[PDB]
Amino acid sequence: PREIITLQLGQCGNQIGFEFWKQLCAEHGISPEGIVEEFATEGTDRKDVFFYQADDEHYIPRAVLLDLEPRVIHSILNSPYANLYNPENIYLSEHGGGAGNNWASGFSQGEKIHEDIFDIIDREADGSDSLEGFVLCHSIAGGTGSGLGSYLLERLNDRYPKKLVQTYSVFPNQDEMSHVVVQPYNSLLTLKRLTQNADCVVVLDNTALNRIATDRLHIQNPSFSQINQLVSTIMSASTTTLRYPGYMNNDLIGLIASLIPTPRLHFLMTGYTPLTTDQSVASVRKTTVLDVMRRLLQPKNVMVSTGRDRQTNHCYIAILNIIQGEVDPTQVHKSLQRIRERKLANFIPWGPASIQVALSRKSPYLPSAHRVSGLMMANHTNISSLFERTCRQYDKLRKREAFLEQFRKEDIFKDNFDELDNSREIVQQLIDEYHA
Amino acid sequence: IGKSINFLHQVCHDQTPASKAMAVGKSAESPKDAAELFTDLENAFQTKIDAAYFDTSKYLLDVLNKNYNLLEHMQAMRRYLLLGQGDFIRHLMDLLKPELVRPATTLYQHNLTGILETAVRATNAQFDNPEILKRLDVRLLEVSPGDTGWDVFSLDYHVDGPIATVFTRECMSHYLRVFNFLWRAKRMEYILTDIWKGHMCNAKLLKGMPELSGVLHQCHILASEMVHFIHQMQYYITFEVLECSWDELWNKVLKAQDLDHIIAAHDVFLDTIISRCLLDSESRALLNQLRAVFDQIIEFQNAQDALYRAALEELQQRLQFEERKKERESETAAEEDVENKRIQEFQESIPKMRSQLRILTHFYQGIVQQFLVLLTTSTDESLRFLSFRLDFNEHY
């Protein structure tokens, strides 16, 4: 019916998808090894849209996880949520990889394991006779997720041409350049494949993570154990129309169709306010829906590093405001009434704009059926500031003679560096041209 | 009281309401009258019949919950004819489309029931418990087989016995009228889904030609404007009428205490929602533009694949001819001629698409301006709410 195959790949893409499947059992009322609660069918009306359909009421995840590093998968099998995963769909015990840290490693390893990489991931494709598409849950940081992920964006474009492609890709961190220095090279090589060899992306910045991780979360030493908490909730938040019973844009080709203006303009800004557990003691007094979307357009919950004074000459075109759970829908048109009076979104002068709001009932659970949740999927034309940030860090590195002799020994014979530079400037010029 | 006491005799119950104490009271009253209270008690006679009218009513509200589930079927019909839950209808309408493109025949009925029964099983694992699937069938019309086939298919909520006391002939005869506009609303939502996937399938394979780069780019802009304007209209007009009418009937059927007030709450419900959906005698200024935008999205759709298939198939001959260039060296002037003929056919299709796009965006500009003035002309009902919403969509 609407079966999606997630493509978890890389050192960071496997960990953000590990707790994504772990989030799904707590809201479906199911255990990874059994069914102890009856809340799975009376409370939740649809479960076989991301999981594989049941053979013994055991909803297998439709997931594949490949990585060159064996460290990310050795921290999985000792956890009690790995018995839900199957040891025959992806790998058996003692799976390995390369050495290995290179973008050209996984780019060259795709055609030497070409027979095996297109054998076991295609067995899940013909399980349903109407496949939705493929989401590449991969990474841009490092050479593991960026090297091999650029290969599958090409060969799955023609072997599966009538399928939706759209990824929840995480952006790397640009604070210092000591541990990694190959960061401007492997990022722009995948970013070219994300626009012409891929339809849509969902951007997730790393410098904007610790802006939120010290905002309300109150940590002193930033660890990697907090990167899975902001990411796994908004992943399950994006499929609330798709997993839980909704009516309009209840498919993944429903939501993405109403937000993309044009190809190579698909970078969607994400926002999510409620992350604090001591808000729970004051939501008993009928906290309404009239105050939760006034702060979405206000740049506080954003996960995109952008300029603060560059929003006057940029214009919103498509903005999504997803409320979940208890909505009190007699005032949801009242919340959309107050949008035109502030004009917090700059509107495009050539065409109409749209503020789309939708709702779906959440899990039968006490932290879910009590507190209001707001998921934002914006589309603003100030996203070229990240593309100006990455390009200015790209041409400055090529004048310092950095990784021009250390990178072209394997499988690179011609200069494909300006092939990425002009196509990035094509994106940056067509964005500003789009508001005439 | 006398109409409700006869309705509980043909409910497969001969039980006097909720107790045998309704016999006791009559005997007490008759002896009391026989020896005492000779003057009529018209102030007190109306008191305990009202204390009889309230108990015979809630007991008659109690016999449905044990046997028939009357107002549970009030909620269950909203999921199919009113399309409350979309997964029942979307997994329907996916499988239902390869039958609707062809015209209908006399062999049209025998397979849709198999398509229906495989669609209600793929979405359910617990809906075999209630009695909804036996009281819901498919209704077709007497239209001749020379049609497009799309307008024949419709679902109907069947009634047999004690569900048919609350559902007369006049109820589902209006429920097909509210279905046909809502089926056409989901018809437009799914054919625009196919052409949006047609935007993203064709653009990935024609990569390699610099002329067709900017050809599809501006045409995707003018197609996205008919996408975003239909979306913020069609999602909002049917969710709002869903909103003010689900919260109208469902919350008052359990606060009033009658069986005749259930239908009195119902007979005002099912004609408010269709009057806000499509049908009034004054609403001829409503369904004239919504059918003028209905055939315009058909005209925008069939012209796209009439020019995509010209733009996509002619590229496929160019790429196989490139493969013949390397094989002739391992195994000329006419080969350059046919290349110049392809470029001329590449040159032909682009102003043919430009001319067949600039004339359809003039039609859409004429539709979007006539859509405003026709919806502002009706006779002082809740149109100020309707004239409110369409100005909010085009500007914000």
From Swiss-Prot, chain A:
Under CDD domains, the record lists: gamma_tubulin (cd02188)
Q: What is its main location?
A: cytoplasm
A GO molecular-function annotation: microtubule nucleator activity
| Residue positions binding GTP | 141-147
Q: Where in the cell is it found?
A: Cytoplasm, Cytoskeleton, Microtubule organizing center, Centrosome; Cytoplasm, Cytoskeleton, Spindle
Protein's GO biological process: cytoplasmic microtubule organization; meiotic spindle organization; microtubule nucleation; mitotic cell cycle; mitotic sister chromatid segregation; mitotic spindle organization
List membrane-spanning regions. none
One Pfam family, short name: Tubulin
Keyword terms, alphabetized: Cytoplasm, Cytoskeleton, GTP-binding, Microtubule, Nucleotide-binding
Which sequence ranges form a coiled-coil region, renumbered to this chain? none
Keyword Cytoplasm among UniProt keywords:
yes
Gene Ontology cellular component terms for the protein in this record: centrosome; cytoplasm; gamma-tubulin complex; gamma-tubulin ring complex; mitotic spindle microtubule; nucleus; polar microtubule; spindle
Which family does the record claim for this protein?
A: Belongs to the tubulin family.
Q: What does this protein do?
A: Tubulin is the major constituent of microtubules. The gamma chain is found at microtubule organizing centers (MTOC) such as the spindle poles or the centrosome, suggesting that it is involved in the minus-end nucleation of microtubule assembly.
Name-wise, this protein is Tubulin gamma-1 chain
Organism listed in the record: Xenopus laevis
The organism that produces this protein has a lineage beginning with:
Eukaryota, Metazoa, Chordata, Craniata, Vertebrata
- The gene designation is tubg1
From Swiss-Prot, chain B:
Localization, UniProt:
Cytoplasm, Cytoskeleton, Microtubule organizing center, Centrosome
Query: Which domain of life does the protein's organism represent?
Result: Eukaryota
* Family listed: Belongs to the TUBGCP family.
What's this chain's function? Necessary for the recruitment of gamma-tubulin to the centrosome and for the formation of a functional centrosome.
The protein's assembly and partners: Interacts with gamma-tubulin.
Q: What is this protein called?
A: Gamma-tubulin complex component 3 homolog
Which organism does this sequence originate in? Answer: Xenopus laevis (African clawed frog)
Q: Which gene encodes it?
A: tubgcp3
- Placed within the complete protein, the shown segment runs 485 to 885 of 906
